[PDB]
Design a protein around this ligand. Structure first.
Ligand SMILES: CCCCCCCCCCCCCCCCCC(=O)OC[C@H](COP(=O)([O-])OCC(O)COP(=O)([O-])OC[C@@H](COC(=O)CCCCCCCCCCCCCCCCC)OC(=O)CCCCCCCCCCCCCCCCC)OC(=O)CCCCCCCCCCCCCCCCC
Ligand SMILES: CCCCCCCCCCCCCCCCCC(=O)OC[C@H](COP(=O)([O-])OCC(O)COP(=O)([O-])OC[C@@H](COC(=O)CCCCCCCCCCCCCCCCC)OC(=O)CCCCCCCCCCCCCCCCC)OC(=O)CCCCCCCCCCCCCCCCC
Ligand SMILES: CCCCCCCCCCCCCCCCCC(=O)OC[C@H](COP(=O)([O-])OCC(O)COP(=O)([O-])OC[C@@H](COC(=O)CCCCCCCCCCCCCCCCC)OC(=O)CCCCCCCCCCCCCCCCC)OC(=O)CCCCCCCCCCCCCCCCC
Ligand SMILES: CCCCCCCCCCCCCCCCC[C@@H](O)O[C@H](CO[C@H](O)CCCCCCCCCCCCCCC)COP(=O)(O)OCC[N+](C)(C)C
Ligand SMILES: CCCCCCCC/C=C/CCCCCCCC(=O)OC[C@H](COP(=O)(O)OCCN)OC(=O)CCCCCCC/C=C/CCCCCCCC
Ligand SMILES: CCCCCCCC/C=C\CCCCCCCC(=O)OC[C@H](COP(=O)(O)OCCN)OC(=O)CCCCCCC/C=C\CCCCCCCC
Ligand SMILES: CCCCCCCC/C=C\CCCCCCCC(=O)OC[C@H](COP(=O)(O)OCCN)OC(=O)CCCCCCC/C=C\CCCCCCCC
Ligand SMILES: CCCCCCCC/C=C\CCCCCCCC(=O)OC[C@H](COP(=O)(O)OCCN)OC(=O)CCCCCCC/C=C\CCCCCCCC
Ligand SMILES: CCCCCCCCCCCCCCCCCC(=O)OC[C@H](COP(=O)(O)OCCN)OC(=O)CCCCCCCCCCCCCCCCC
Lengths: 56, 603, 459, 174, 99
């Protein structure tokens, strides 16, 4: 029945959840390199009234 | 917008269309050959229209429709050069291909893969159109290699025939030497001019040098089967008769001449390359005609005639007459295609017999093919007002009246005489006399397809030269004033060849037997060139490929130097180290020696 | 790069937890999905690389190699499921595990940002390959082949490790960005000569260089089909990638030290083409063709001009795809007749039409046929070598002629002629085999349509 | 057309002679041009009109990115990684712009040769001189930098060139 | 003989049991679904979607940006009589040559 389907096809979510976790870890790695954000001579600009950071 | 670009690109696209429909029920049915032929006819008319547009106002254009890639300062784009040469060669090639396709509908009826045959013919036509209309060297090379591989695939049509496979591979080998020359020229042009297109090449090369021009000359010799690289064209007669008629003789072997024509400014600037071109063309036409006059296979005779005409075109280029070369290209396409079709009809009516020794009586046995072949032979030899007269006569007049090589001039005249000789040989041994074929007479030429195709190619062999010569603008200074004997040199040598060959053929009826001469053996056996040059270099290369490279170096010395010697040394050292008797006396004496050495030598 | 690294490390438990008959389906489907995800790396910048973090970065040279690796994994899965039908479930899962580990190591190798991490990963790629060869090979010579492959690569790579740690002690960092910005000229001294030799010789053995290449025929002939596919398609490209990376710090000494390697590469290109002319084994013929093409790539990297680097990258990608396709075709023939001799089976065009078409297309791409990316790369390399010197054109022309000769000779021998009479077990081609050939060939033509994606950073 | 700038891509004024027929025979080119206009040009014009009507309802705009200038490698200190990075990126952008400049000049040359046709040797001397000058300057700037070119290597080459020019000037004055 | 070894097994043909076999697996249902997923995912998804995605990738290489910049610079320089290609990459005033 349905229980046997999940018992056999619970492995098909492993790669998708791995991809989601990888995207999350990429965001976490990006958020630690925010040392020159809105500080490069080429891309330095004034912040818009309703924004806190130039990029995330 | 001007219809010129639209109509030219439309002809090319509708040529490409039936290849798309090769994955359909129409391709699975038996209507595909007629469908392809109809498409080619429509393309022919739609290409005739821009030819009319050009012959009025001399309109020429280039179309850089699609940009492929920019290698920093070099831009490669899909560009087509619709000039005089392109708009005059596309309709002629389409006309010839239409006739060949109808003839192949009649001729290949029993072939299980006639649909594949027609798809391959259309693919060859597409690649040839790409080659002719190419505006840059890379697209020209695309068309070059495409016609090369399509020739490879169509020559080896019968995959079970080892001779067909050898012919295909030999054609590939010679065309690859030509491609070596082509790549040399491409590399030089890009390196020294930062361009792969004709406009900038011509702008920057005010005095084109020997290296690029010799590269181009080598490529043209390889593709057009000049001397040294000639044997592949006669060997290409292994393919079906439609292949020989359309691909090789008419439209593909003219690729090298066309390449040399497209660079006529640079050829004009240089002189040593012109001399080399003239000499190569002269020796090619002479040698190929000399081999032709004594062959017994009708397809071989026509192939050698094609090679001789190509040599004449190369002579025309070398005397700095590029436009006469193009005119002769068109005229030769017409009458040589018709000659090949006539020989194919003869072969099919006589149950796959290709020997003039077994033909005979066909003058009355087959009326229409007989009159067509006679007209084609008259056009080939330059009958004073047929299609071949408007090009060959002018070529001979220009050769005699120019500052040329004396030996090249003499060889050109002798080649014209031998052209007349071998045309007489074909007529005499094929149509005149008594039958020599097996008694079961299956001679039948009443097929509307065969008759209509030969009719269409027969009108061109009579009138096309007049129309084409009278409609093109004057692109060269005529030789109005010349001595009477020089004006009549072509006719005199043609008539002398006719008479001498006819007499020598009439002597074959006598009840007299004599063994062949050394000159006869040299002429009949193709000058011994295929024997020596196909047994010696190949044997030496294939022998060194195994005795020296694979066996001596790879399997023996590269194994001995690095991996074997190191392994042997390590094995010997391991045996020395581990071969101990396990005696405390021995290795304690060793300990004593080590202690003494460490005490004395280490301070 | 974690969005691509983690799904492979999840391919591992999924393969080990899936049912006994769903392993191939799951592995193939999710490998294809990972390849689709990795296609997003081709969007590169014109100024600098894609700096994901302190550990992984992507460039116009790394991106196509990653896409090729990720696309190559499912094809190896299809071939493996062809030839491993009677294996036990645990051994099938171990085979898939070795393939997955190899792919993960290759991905991290191409995306590593330090030379030392690159070294560690590109040396870690040897273990799965050696296990695959020496465990699932068919014949006896697989053991000797594994020994040759392993010891050639390690004898090449150990001086590279010493040189890398020395360079880090000397300059302070092995990060590729830092060593590109803080590069200094290399003086002509014996010490610099031997540092140059250490690095270059490691990657030349990995290429391989002519005279250092016997392990390549040994390993490629005796490995299973998946091992042969990965060895030729990707593992030969680690040497080229490494040479295109390390030569930043070896100038101007490369101008003087490249003569022996250029002469070896050109003459060995000629020699290996000639060897291909007289080969009695199909796999050996394909292996020596690989040697010739990689010799051309070595020439490009050594002459080291912007036109040569683009040609090197294009030729690397094209050769990977073409050699993989050729190995697959030879393996299908082998599975028919259980022998590798070229003249044993003939008439395969009259017995198997569509396979004859695939053979024709693959052989046409093996020789430089325009406008294929094979020709694009070879032509760029030839042009750069012509600007280098004007007899390189002679050598390149000879090589092109012989390449066409042996490719068409292989096609004519295997396909054309009359069928062998006593071989009556040649069953019709499988949909799996036909799909494998299609998946090899269609991306190559699409790359021909869009050629700027595989021309490297110098474009 | 307003698609491109006529000053960047010049085209000489087009002089088309008026037809002056001398025969009563009909002109097949004229008849076929009329047929082409009736059968092809009108339907394609109608289709393009419909497409452009559909486009005008969803009109949106895109912009051209502007990079402000930054100090170059001459101003950057030795092993100052951030300034070196900014200067190197700026030099690469300038290299790309110079390559496109050379591409524009080459396009001018090709188009002029094709347009002039048979009198190209004399009528395209103006565009040949501009191409010669631009190619000379571009070659002197970026001729032999190598595969691993950089702003530092270009600066070193410029220093070598300046030293050579100074030495030549001193020798001439001596 | 020197061993108790099994005889070499006969080659197993997938077409004998299953005439409409795709060559993936012995089980007909597993074989059919393996074919379906391979064809669908590979051909449809990867080929078509990846090819169109690559075709319509945004111009991050700044090809058109560089062309527009070059057009602007050419227009400005030829309007003012300046050379189209500057003679030096850097400023000789900011470059200090050794004595
Ligand atoms: C190293 C040398 C390099 C030379 C380079 C230059 C080469 C130039 C070539 C010149 C042309 C050679 C023609 C013959 C070659 C083929 C021979 C052969 O086997 O034919 C059989 C072959 C028949 O084949 P088949 O049906 O199988 O029968 C088998 C035979 O029965 C089998 O019987 P067979 O074996 O007895 O038949 C051959 C026999 C019979 O053939 C002939 O007699 C052909 C004669 C052709 C005409 C020659 C005289 C032309 C006179 C022209 C006069 C007017 C000039 C213009 C001015 C007029 C106003 C003043 O020929 C000979 O014995 C020799 C003929 C002349 C050879 C010339 C080359 C010499 C090479 C070196 C010397 C060798 C000497 C020893 C020979 C070997 C040892 C014994 O003949 C033909 O099909 C036709 C033959 C040629 C017809 C055309 C002739 C005219 C065109 C060429 C001459 C030039 C005319 C003027 C041109 C314009 C000038 C401005
Ligand atoms: C043996 C006869 C011989 O010298 O053959 C050289 C010859 C190299 O070709 P080439 O065109 O004569 O060399 C150009 C100049 O002669 C030499 O070029 P150059 O004078 O312009 O200066 C560059 C020279 C700078 O000179 C040095 O660095 C000499 C100082 C000692 C170098 C020791 C190299 C150790 C690393 C390689 C170890 C394996 C070999 O570079 C080298 O010596 C490169 C050393 C590595 C050569 C190739 C290594 C792979 C061999 C594969 C086949 C093995 C079987 O053949 C071999 O090296 C392989 C066969 C002999 C082993
Ligand atoms: C792309 C198509 C890839 C097809 C792979 C095989 C598919 C298959 O199973 O087919 C069997 C299937 C049914 O056959 P069947 O009788 O049931 O099966 C029994 C045998 O298998 C029947 O076997 P078969 O002998 O009938 O096989 C048909 C075909 C199957 O073989 C092929 O299709 C070979 C194609 C790959 C050649 C590889 C080397 C060259 C690389 C060029 C890369 C260009 C990429 C362009 C973009 C491609 C995007 C996919 O083989 C040939 O036609 C012989 C080789 C001819 C090669 C000629 C190449 C010349 C250069 C063309 C350059 C064009 C681009 C630049 C243009 C620049 C100026 C505008 O046939 C088809 O579905 C027909 C497909 C199209 C065949 C002709 C391909 C023409 C290629 C372009 C020529 C230029 C004109 C424009 C045409 C536009 C359309
Ligand atoms: C006459 C002879 C003609 C024979 C060929 C005819 C083929 C049909 C005509 C060509 C097709 C119409 C043109 C399509 C072309 O324009 O698109 C190409 C694009 O094709 C794709 O990019 C090819 C994708 C190749 C990548 C495939 C990835 C699938 C997975 C493969 C994995 C293995 C890859 C390993 C190496 C990476 C080129 O890009 P581009 O013209 O400007 O796109 C226009 C859109 N713009 C204007 C917005 C830019
Ligand atoms: C640029 C470098 C190359 C320069 C020339 C080198 C030639 C090297 C020869 C190639 C090595 C041969 C390897 C295998 C080739 C294919 C296998 C093979 O030998 O088949 C032989 C095959 C079959 O023999 P058939 O005559 O058809 O008899 C059929 C009987 N049923 O014949 C061939 O293809 C032989 C082709 C070898 C050509 C050798 C000579 C080539 C001429 C080159 C010199 C000419 C220069 C041209 C100057 C042009 C001036 C601008
Ligand atoms: C199919 C029928 C479709 C039915 C509707 C017709 C559509 C009409 C509208 C045309 C579509 C719009 C369009 O074409 O946009 C242009 C668009 C891209 O714009 P670019 O300016 O080139 O940008 C630079 C890319 N590097 O061009 C195209 O995609 C059309 C391409 C068709 C050209 C012919 C196809 C090419 C096939 C040859 C393969 C490659 C050969 C290599 C050539 C070597 C040349 C040196
Ligand atoms: C002073 C410092 C130098 C000291 C030594 C430095 C070592 C340098 C590298 C050594 C390579 C180590 C591998 C060789 C070890 C010894 C091999 C050996 O024993 O040869 C015998 C062996 C057969 O005997 P067995 O397999 O042991 O079984 C016999 C059953 N009747 O012969 C073989 O064919 C095996 C050889 C191993 C593969 C070949 C080695 C691979 C190439 C080695 C050099 C690599 C070149 C560098 C690039
Ligand atoms: C038997 C003969 C073997 C000859 C081949 C060499 C292989 C054995 C390696 C033993 C070392 C021999 C070379 C030593 C070079 C060296 O130490 O100097 C390099 C230099 C030393 O500089 P300093 O000591 O600081 O001097 C300061 C000056 N004021 O250090 C470096 O640059 C790092 C270089 C790493 C050592 C490289 C040695 C290997 C050289 C290439 C051989 C590898 C080839 C690979 C084999 C594959 C084909 C068989
Ligand atoms: C061993 C010596 C020869 C070495 C090269 C050929 C080796 C055989 C294999 C050839 C393989 C294909 C490559 C052919 C390259 C031909 C290059 C060439 O013809 O260069 C022309 C050469 C230099 O001309 P360039 O410098 O441009 O102009 C100034 C005037 N010297 O101008 C000259 O050299 C003047 C003489 C012109 C005639 C040269 C004919 C060469 C034919 C080569 C192909 C033969 C097949």
């Amino acid at each position: 029945n349905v229980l046997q389907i999940v018992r056999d096809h619970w492995v098909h979510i492993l790669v998708p959840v791995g991809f989601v976790f990888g995207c999350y870890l990429d965001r976490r790695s990006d958020e630690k390199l925010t040392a020159f954000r809105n500080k490069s001579l080429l891309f330095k600009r004034e912040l818009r009234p309703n924004e806190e950071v130039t990029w995330k | 917008m001007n219809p010129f670009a639209s109509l030219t690109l439309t002809t090319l696209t509708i040529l490409t269309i039936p290849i798309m429909m090769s994955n359909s029920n129409i391709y699975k049915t038996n209507l595909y050959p007629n469908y392809v032929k109809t498409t080619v006819s429509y393309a022919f008319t739609l290409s005739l229209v821009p030819l009319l547009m050009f012959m009025h106002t001399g309109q020429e254009m280039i179309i850089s429709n699609w940009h492929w890639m920019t290698l920093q300062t070099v831009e490669l784009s899909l560009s087509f050069k619709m000039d005089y040469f392109s708009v005059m060669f596309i309709p002629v090639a389409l006309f010839v291909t239409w006739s060949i396709m109808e003839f192949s509908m009649w001729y290949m009826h029993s072939d299980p893969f006639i649909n594949r045959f027609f798809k391959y013919l259309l693919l060859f036509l597409i690649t040839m159109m790409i080659l002719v209309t190419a505006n840059n060297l890379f697209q020209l090379f695309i068309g070059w290699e495409g016609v090369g591989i399509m020739s490879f695939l169509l020559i080896g049509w019968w995959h079970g025939r080892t001779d067909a496979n050898t012919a295909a591979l030999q054609a590939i080998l010679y065309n690859r030497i030509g491609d070596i020359g082509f790549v040399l020229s491409m590399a030089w042009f890009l390196t020294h001019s930062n361009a792969w297109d004709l406009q900038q090449i011509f702008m920057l090369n005010n005095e084109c040098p020997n290296m690029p021009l010799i590269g181009l000359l080598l490529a043209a010799a390889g593709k057009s089967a000049q001397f040294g690289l000639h044997p592949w064209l006669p060997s290409a007669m292994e393919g079906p008769t439609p292949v020989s008629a359309l691909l090789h003789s008419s439209t593909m072997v003219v690729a090298g001449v066309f390449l040399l024509i497209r660079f006529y400014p640079l050829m004009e600037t240089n002189k040593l390359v012109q001399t080399m071109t003239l000499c190569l063309g002269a020796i090619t036409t002479l040698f190929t005609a000399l081999c032709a006059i004594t062959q017994n296979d009708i397809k071989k005779i026509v192939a050698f005639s094609t090679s001789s005409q190509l040599g004449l075109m190369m002579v025309t280029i070398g005397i700095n007459q590029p436009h006469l070369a193009f005119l002769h290209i068109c005229m030769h396409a017409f009458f040589k295609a018709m000659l090949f079709m006539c020989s194919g009809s003869i072969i099919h009516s006589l149950n796959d017999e290709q020997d003039i020794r077994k033909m005979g009586g066909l003058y009355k046995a087959m009326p229409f093919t007989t009159t067509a072949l006679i007209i084609g032979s008259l056009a080939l030899t330059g009958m004073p007002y047929l299609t071949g007269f408007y090009s060959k006569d002018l070529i001979i007049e220009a050769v005699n009246m120019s500052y040329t090589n004396a030996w090249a001039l003499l060889m050109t005249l002798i080649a014209t005489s031998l052209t007349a000789a071998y045309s007489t040989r074909i007529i005499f041994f094929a149509f005149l006399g008594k039958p020599r074929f097996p008694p079961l007479v299956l001679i039948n030429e009443n097929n509307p397809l065969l008759i209509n195709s030969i009719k269409r190619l027969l009108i061109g062999s009579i009138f096309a030269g007049f129309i084409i010569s009278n409609n093109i603008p004057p692109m060269t200074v005529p030789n109005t004033t010349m001595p009477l004997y020089m004006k009549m040199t072509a006719l005199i040598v043609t008539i002398m060849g006719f008479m001498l060959a006819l007499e020598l053929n009439n002597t074959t009826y006598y009840l007299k037997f004599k063994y062949p001469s050394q000159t006869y053996k040299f002429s009949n056996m193709l000058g011994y060139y295929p024997s020596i040059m196909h047994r010696l270099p190949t044997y030496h290369n294939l022998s060194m490929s195994q005795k020296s490279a694979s066996s001596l170096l790879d399997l023996i010395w590269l194994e001995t130097i690095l991996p074997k010697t190191t392994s042997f040394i390590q094995m010997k050292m391991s045996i020395m180290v581990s071969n101990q008797k396990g005696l405390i006396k021995l290795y304690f004496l060793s300990f004593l020696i080590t202690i003494m050495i460490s005490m004395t030598l280490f301070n | 790069m974690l969005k691509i690294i983690i799904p492979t490390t999840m391919l591992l438990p999924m393969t080990w937890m899936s049912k006994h008959n769903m392993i191939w389906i799951n592995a193939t489907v999710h490998s294809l999905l990972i390849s689709l995800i990795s296609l997003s790396l081709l969007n590169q910048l014109g100024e600098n690389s894609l700096n994901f973090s302190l550990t992984f970065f992507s460039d116009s040279l790394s991106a196509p190699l990653l896409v090729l690796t990720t696309w190559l994994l499912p094809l190896m899965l299809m071939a493996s499921q062809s030839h491993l039908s009677k294996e036990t479930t645990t051994r099938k899962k171990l085979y898939i595990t070795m393939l997955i580990l190899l792919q993960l190591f290759l991905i991290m190798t191409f995306t590593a940002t330090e030379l030392i991490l690159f070294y560690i990963l590109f040396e870690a790629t040897l273990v799965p390959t050696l296990i695959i060869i020496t465990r699932w090979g068919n014949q006896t010579e697989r053991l000797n082949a594994g020994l040759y492959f392993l010891f050639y690569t390690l004898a090449g790579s150990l001086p590279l490790l010493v040189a890398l740690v020395y360079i880090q002690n000397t300059t302070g960092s092995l990060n590729f960005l830092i060593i590109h910005y803080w590069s200094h000229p290399l003086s002509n001294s014996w010490s610099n000569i031997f540092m140059w030799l250490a690095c270059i010789m490691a990657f030349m053995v990995k290429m391989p260089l002519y005279g250092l290449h016997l392990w390549l025929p040994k390993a490629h002939v005796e490995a299973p089909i998946a091992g042969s596919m990965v060895l030729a398609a990707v593992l030969l490209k680690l040497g080229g990638y490494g040479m295109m990376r390390i030569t930043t710090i070896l100038n101007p000494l490369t101008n003087y030290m490249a003569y022996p390697f250029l002469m070896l590469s050109m003459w060995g290109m000629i020699m290996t083409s000639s060897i291909c002319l007289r080969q009695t084994d199909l796999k050996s013929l394909i292996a020596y063709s690989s040697v010739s093409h990689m010799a051309l790539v070595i020439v490009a990297i050594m002459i080291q001009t912007p036109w040569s680097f683009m040609g090197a990258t294009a030729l690397m990608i094209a050769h990977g795809l073409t050699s993989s396709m050729l190995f697959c075709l030879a393996n299908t023939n082998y599975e028919r007749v259980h022998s590798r001799t070229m003249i044993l089976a003939r008439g395969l065009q009259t017995l198997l039409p569509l396979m004859a078409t695939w053979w024709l297309v693959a052989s046409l791409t093996n020789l430089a046929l325009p406008p294929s990316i094979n020709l694009i790369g070879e032509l760029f390399i030839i042009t750069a070598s012509f600007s280098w010197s004007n007899i390189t054109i002679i050598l390149m022309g000879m090589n092109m002629m012989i390449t066409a000769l042996y490719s068409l000779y292989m096609l004519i021998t295997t396909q054309r002629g009359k069928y062998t009479h006593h071989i009556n077990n040649i069953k019709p081609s499988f949909t799996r085999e036909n799909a494998l050939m299609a998946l090899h060939i269609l991306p190559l033509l699409l790359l021909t349509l869009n050629p700027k994606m595989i021309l490297g950073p110098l474009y | 057309p307003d698609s491109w700038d006529k000053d960047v891509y010049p085209e000489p004024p087009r002089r088309t002679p008026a037809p002056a027929p001398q025969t009563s025979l009909p002109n097949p080119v004229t008849y076929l041009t009329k047929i082409f206009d009736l059968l092809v040009d009108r339907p394609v014009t109608l289709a393009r009109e419909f497409i452009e009507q559909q486009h005008a309802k969803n009109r949106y705009y895109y912009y051209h990115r502007e990079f402000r200038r930054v100090p170059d490698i001459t101003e950057c200190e030795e092993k100052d990684i951030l300034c070196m990075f900014e200067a190197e990126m700026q030099w690469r952008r300038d290299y790309k712009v110079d390559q496109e400049i050379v591409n524009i000049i080459q396009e001018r040359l090709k188009a002029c040769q094709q347009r002039e046709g048979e009198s190209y040797r004399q009528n395209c001397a103006k565009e040949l001189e501009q191409f010669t000058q631009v190619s000379k300057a571009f070659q002197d700037r970026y001729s032999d930098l190598g595969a691993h070119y950089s702003a530092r290597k270009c600066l070193a080459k410029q220093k070598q060139r300046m030293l050579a020019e100074r030495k030549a000037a001193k020798e001439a004055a001596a | 003989i020197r061993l108790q070894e099994d005889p070499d097994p006969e080659d197993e043909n997938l077409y004998e049991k299953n005439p409409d076999s795709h060559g993936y697996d012995k089980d007909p249902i597993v074989d059919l679904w393996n074919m379906r997923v391979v064809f669908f995912f590979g051909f449809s998804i990867v080929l078509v979607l990846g090819s169109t995605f690559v075709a319509y990738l945004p111009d991050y290489r700044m090809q058109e940006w560089a062309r527009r910049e070059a057009e602007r610079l050419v227009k400005y320089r030829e309007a003012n009589g300046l050379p189209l290609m500057e003679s030096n990459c850097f400023d000789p005033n900011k470059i200090q040559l050794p004595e």
